[PDB]
Design an enzyme around this catalytic site. Structure first.
Site, PDB file in Angstrom:
ATOM      1  N   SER A 152       3.006  -1.881 -21.692  1.00 18.59           N
ATOM      2  CA  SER A 152       3.419  -2.868 -22.557  1.00 18.59           C
ATOM      3  C   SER A 152       3.749  -3.895 -21.791  1.00 18.59           C
ATOM      4  O   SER A 152       3.426  -5.467 -21.057  1.00 18.59           O
ATOM      5  CB  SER A 152       4.100  -3.310 -23.927  1.00 18.59           C
ATOM      6  OG  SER A 152       3.746  -3.397 -25.219  1.00 18.59           O
TER       7      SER A 152
ATOM      8  N   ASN B 280       1.660   3.401 -25.102  1.00 18.85           N
ATOM      9  CA  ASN B 280       2.477   4.540 -25.185  1.00 18.85           C
ATOM     10  C   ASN B 280       2.215   5.697 -25.500  1.00 18.85           C
ATOM     11  O   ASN B 280       3.542   6.482 -25.390  1.00 18.85           O
ATOM     12  CB  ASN B 280       3.733   4.483 -25.070  1.00 18.85           C
ATOM     13  CG  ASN B 280       3.643   2.845 -24.826  1.00 18.85           C
ATOM     14  OD1 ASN B 280       3.440   2.343 -23.705  1.00 18.85           O
ATOM     15  ND2 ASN B 280       4.359   1.958 -25.590  1.00 18.85           N
TER      16      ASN B 280
ATOM     17  N   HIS C 104      10.599  -9.094 -26.402  1.00 17.98           N
ATOM     18  CA  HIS C 104       9.336  -8.186 -25.890  1.00 17.98           C
ATOM     19  C   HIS C 104       8.435  -9.325 -25.597  1.00 17.98           C
ATOM     20  O   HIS C 104       7.165  -9.044 -24.518  1.00 17.98           O
ATOM     21  CB  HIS C 104       9.072  -6.936 -26.792  1.00 17.98           C
ATOM     22  CG  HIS C 104       7.821  -6.455 -25.838  1.00 17.98           C
ATOM     23  ND1 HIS C 104       6.237  -6.762 -26.639  1.00 17.98           N
ATOM     24  CD2 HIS C 104       7.428  -5.306 -25.447  1.00 17.98           C
ATOM     25  CE1 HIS C 104       5.556  -6.100 -26.012  1.00 17.98           C
ATOM     26  NE2 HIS C 104       6.258  -4.840 -24.950  1.00 17.98           N
TER      27      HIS C 104
ATOM     28  N   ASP D 260      -8.703   1.396 -17.151  1.00 16.72           N
ATOM     29  CA  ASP D 260     -10.160   0.855 -16.180  1.00 16.72           C
ATOM     30  C   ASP D 260      -8.277   0.136 -14.920  1.00 16.72           C
ATOM     31  O   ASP D 260      -9.342   0.682 -13.703  1.00 16.72           O
ATOM     32  CB  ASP D 260     -10.027  -0.582 -16.058  1.00 16.72           C
ATOM     33  CG  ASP D 260     -10.886  -0.850 -17.588  1.00 16.72           C
ATOM     34  OD1 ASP D 260     -12.059  -0.059 -17.272  1.00 16.72           O
ATOM     35  OD2 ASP D 260     -10.835  -1.883 -18.172  1.00 16.72           O
TER      36      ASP D 260
ATOM     37  N   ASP E  61       1.659 -11.852 -28.642  1.00 17.70           N
ATOM     38  CA  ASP E  61       2.835 -10.913 -28.881  1.00 17.70           C
ATOM     39  C   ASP E  61       4.487 -11.497 -29.501  1.00 17.70           C
ATOM     40  O   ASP E  61       3.619 -12.445 -30.887  1.00 17.70           O
ATOM     41  CB  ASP E  61       3.834 -10.796 -27.429  1.00 17.70           C
ATOM     42  CG  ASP E  61       4.465  -9.500 -27.174  1.00 17.70           C
ATOM     43  OD1 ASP E  61       5.511  -9.599 -27.749  1.00 17.70           O
ATOM     44  OD2 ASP E  61       3.780  -8.315 -26.594  1.00 17.70           O
TER      45      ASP E  61
ATOM     46  N   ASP F 238      -3.708   7.330  -5.386  1.00 20.20           N
ATOM     47  CA  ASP F 238      -2.206   7.230  -4.540  1.00 20.20           C
ATOM     48  C   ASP F 238      -1.678   7.726  -6.096  1.00 20.20           C
ATOM     49  O   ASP F 238       0.338   7.382  -5.994  1.00 20.20           O
ATOM     50  CB  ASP F 238      -2.403   6.413  -4.669  1.00 20.20           C
ATOM     51  CG  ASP F 238      -2.898   5.763  -2.998  1.00 20.20           C
ATOM     52  OD1 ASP F 238      -2.998   6.491  -2.281  1.00 20.20           O
ATOM     53  OD2 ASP F 238      -2.798   4.094  -2.605  1.00 20.20           O
TER      54      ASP F 238
ATOM     55  N   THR G   1       0.990  -1.476   0.212  1.00 21.39           N
ATOM     56  CA  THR G   1      -0.208   0.567   0.280  1.00 21.39           C
ATOM     57  C   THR G   1       0.609   1.106  -0.272  1.00 21.39           C
ATOM     58  O   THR G   1       0.289   1.960  -0.234  1.00 21.39           O
ATOM     59  CB  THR G   1      -0.768   0.267   1.429  1.00 21.39           C
ATOM     60  OG1 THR G   1       0.014   0.381   2.477  1.00 21.39           O
ATOM     61  CG2 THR G   1      -1.862  -1.279   0.989  1.00 21.39           C
TER      62      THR G   1
ATOM     63  N   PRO H 225     -14.597  -0.962 -24.420  1.00 18.26           N
ATOM     64  CA  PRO H 225     -15.162  -1.042 -23.081  1.00 18.26           C
ATOM     65  C   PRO H 225     -14.682  -1.852 -22.245  1.00 18.26           C
ATOM     66  O   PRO H 225     -14.553  -2.542 -21.122  1.00 18.26           O
ATOM     67  CB  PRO H 225     -16.459  -0.400 -23.608  1.00 18.26           C
ATOM     68  CG  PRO H 225     -16.461   0.271 -24.710  1.00 18.26           C
ATOM     69  CD  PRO H 225     -15.365  -0.798 -25.405  1.00 18.26           C
TER      70      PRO H 225
ATOM     71  N   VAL I 283     -12.836  -4.830 -22.135  1.00 20.38           N
ATOM     72  CA  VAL I 283     -11.523  -5.478 -21.918  1.00 20.38           C
ATOM     73  C   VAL I 283     -10.970  -5.204 -20.331  1.00 20.38           C
ATOM     74  O   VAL I 283     -11.725  -3.789 -20.396  1.00 20.38           O
ATOM     75  CB  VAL I 283     -10.404  -6.135 -23.366  1.00 20.38           C
ATOM     76  CG1 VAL I 283     -11.724  -6.544 -24.023  1.00 20.38           C
ATOM     77  CG2 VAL I 283      -9.924  -4.466 -23.622  1.00 20.38           C
TER      78      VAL I 283
END
Length: 279
Positions: free
Chosen positions: A224, A161, A69, A200, A39, A260, A16, A175, A177
């Site tokens: 990614s 990015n 990657h 999300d 990927d 946060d 936390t 929306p 996923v």
């Protein structure tokens, strides 16, 4: 359990407050779950996967990860030292070439493939899909991800990015996923991370140690990299029975660290992925 000297992102997930270095988790470790890493492939021979990784589909002359990657993201899902869900099973789908590029027709084909392929595999705890990819807005690409989600797979996709609103990128703008933004070890929004209302959840995304090709490791940054943190977590919890494929994204956002992160624009959620494991 505890993993001392773990990558900062693993510690972040379990804590936390930022700045810690031990990753606390339930020893079940995604066992009985499966995560498809869609990927550039996975170097399944890498000792860090321990024989739990395997390729299941490629769309190119070779199913080898010639780039790293795909291997990096898989390491964040379930590698022993760098992964969130260390006992999960990993299945590689190579929709991106060794320069990281891939046509939409191929990625779509790759997502439809996973929806049918989970029916050949033993995943009594459920199925997750990590999609560290995207491009400009495409309705067919968004529909591809929503089908995969409706088929019974927890889909986590990267926000992008571009330091812009993810409404103009796909599958990020779909929306149904789970669209993951990136943060850094100081709980700032990563300087590159897309934002917007379609987002999300946020995960660790700046300077992320994980596996690489050639039996190696390295640190890279991007949304990614945050996507597989959220992918591993879902699989973790699903094994724990806390959530299901269809509800994991809401659960993770419901149980995240709220308010946060710094430099979250107005309209974007302030939620950092969190496992609330009380040991």
């Amino acid at each position: 359990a505890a993993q001392t000297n773990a990558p900062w992102g693993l510690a972040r997930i379990s804590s936390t407050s930022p700045g810690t270095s031990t990753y606390y988790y339930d020893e079940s470790a995604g066992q009985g779950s499966c995560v498809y890493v869609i990927d550039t492939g996975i170097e399944a021979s890498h000792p860090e996967f321990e024989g739990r990784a395997q390729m299941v589909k490629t769309y190119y002359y070779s199913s080898r990860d010639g780039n790293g990657h795909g291997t990096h993201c898989a390491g964040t899902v379930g590698s022993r030292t760098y992964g969130v869900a260390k006992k999960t099973q990993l299945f590689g789908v190579k929709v991106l070439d060794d320069n990281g590029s891939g046509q939409y027709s191929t990625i779509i084909a790759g997502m439809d493939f996973v929806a049918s392929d989970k029916n050949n595999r033993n995943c009594p705890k459920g199925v997750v899909a990590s999609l560290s990819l995207g491009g400009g807005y495409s309705s067919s690409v968004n529909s591809a991800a929503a089908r995969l989600q409706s088929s019974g797979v927890m889909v986590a996709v990267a926000a992008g990015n571009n330091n812009a609103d993810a409404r103009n990128y796909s599958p990020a703008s779909e929306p149904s996923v789970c669209t993951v933004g990136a943060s850094d070890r100081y709980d700032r929004r990563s300087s590159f991370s897309n934002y917007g209302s379609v987002l999300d959840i946020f995960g660790p995304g700046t300077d992320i140690l994980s596996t690489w090709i050639g039996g190696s490791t390295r640190s890279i940054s991007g949304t990614s990299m945050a996507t597989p943190h959220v992918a591993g977590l879902a699989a973790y919890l699903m094994t724990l029975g806390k959530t299901t494929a269809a509800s994991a994204c809401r659960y993770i956002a419901d149980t995240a660290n709220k308010g946060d992160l710094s430099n979250i624009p107005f309209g974007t959620v302030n939620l950092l992925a969190y496992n609330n494991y009380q040991a």
